[PDB]
Design a binder for this molecule. Structure first.
Ligand code: A1BYL
Length: 266
């Protein structure tokens, strides 16, 4: 099927500039769009591969590409996510994240990944750092630099044979949920990356997070099966976490539980 996605090229005089470079700015084509601008031939060839992917996806739980600017430096312009990556957010707000937010985030990430699977697209880098927060009630998947290596998030098949599937993304989804349920802990913290391949082969997995019932930890374990086709599908993960979002305290035990956004500029 032909990929009739549009690549928008923006004037540099429309922007008015966060991490290193990514910047916070406004895009004024009477409308002001809060945006994030990201400034050798290797660098330009890879950032255009990323713009190709983001321009070809359109889903409420996937980061939208607004355009590229062709100046001395190739600049990517995306929707500004004011609350950051989900990894920093869960670390800075542990004392205030409820089970409702955690389970709903798991639903939204699975929806975004299920859409990426419909697009016949493998992310290859699903992680808590690569999930941005529009509002605490709305997250989106980002960073498609490897979307067609971080060993601690990869399936065993990706480590050994460099094989990547939608089901290897499911493994990365399992680690991402584990980062959230541990409020931002580091997977296999301390263990050198060269030893991860031996550990997984022996049968060991990431531990059960303290706030997780066996229901939630069972889903993570299923994402980490050696047999990729035995791991759950993203459409099933949506269904499972959505049921748990209807009674969150039953599955997560936690103590004390003219500016227009890009989503409206279509
Ligand atoms: C964990 C890091 C982070 O996300 N920080 C952050 C982000 C935003 N908004 C935002 N919107 C859209 C895109 C980006 C963004 C994209 N990339 C690259 C890899 C694809 C980066 C890289 C580094 C930073 C940001 C991006 N970001 C914020 O909106 C405001 C605020 C934050 N912070 C919490 C800043 C403090 N961090 C320690 C950097």
């Amino acid at each position: 099927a032909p990929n009739q996605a549009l690549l928008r090229i923006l004037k540099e005089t429309e922007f008015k500039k966060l991490g290193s470079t990514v910047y916070k700015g406004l895009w004024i084509p009477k409308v002001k769009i809060p945006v994030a601008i990201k400034e050798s031939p290797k660098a330009n060839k890879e950032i255009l591969d990323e713009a190709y992917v983001m321009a070809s996806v359109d889903n409420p739980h996937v980061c939208r590409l607004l355009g590229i600017c062709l100046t001395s430096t190739v600049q990517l312009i995306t929707q500004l996510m004011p609350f950051g990556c989900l990894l920093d957010y869960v670390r800075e707000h542990k004392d205030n994240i409820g089970s409702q937010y955690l389970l709903n985030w798991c639903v939204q990430i699975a929806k975004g990944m299920n859409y990426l699977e419909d697009r016949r697209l493998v992310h290859r880098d699903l992680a808590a750092r690569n999930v941005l927060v529009k509002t605490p009630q709305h997250v989106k998947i980002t960073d498609f630099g490897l979307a067609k290596v971080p060993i601690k998030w990869m399936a065993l098949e990706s480590i050994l044979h460099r094989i990547y599937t939608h089901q290897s993304d499911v493994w990365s989804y399992g680690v991402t949920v584990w980062e959230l349920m541990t409020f931002g802990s580091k997977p296999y913290d301390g263990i050198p990356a060269s030893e991860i391949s031996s550990i997984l082969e022996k049968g060991e997995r990431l531990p059960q997070p303290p706030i997780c019932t066996i229901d939630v930890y069972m889903i993570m374990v299923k994402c980490w099966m050696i047999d990729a086709d035995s791991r759950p599908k993203f459409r099933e993960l949506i269904i499972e976490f959505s049921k748990m979002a209807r009674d969150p305290q039953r599955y997560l035990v936690i103590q004390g539980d003219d500016v227009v956004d890009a989503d409206e500029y279509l």
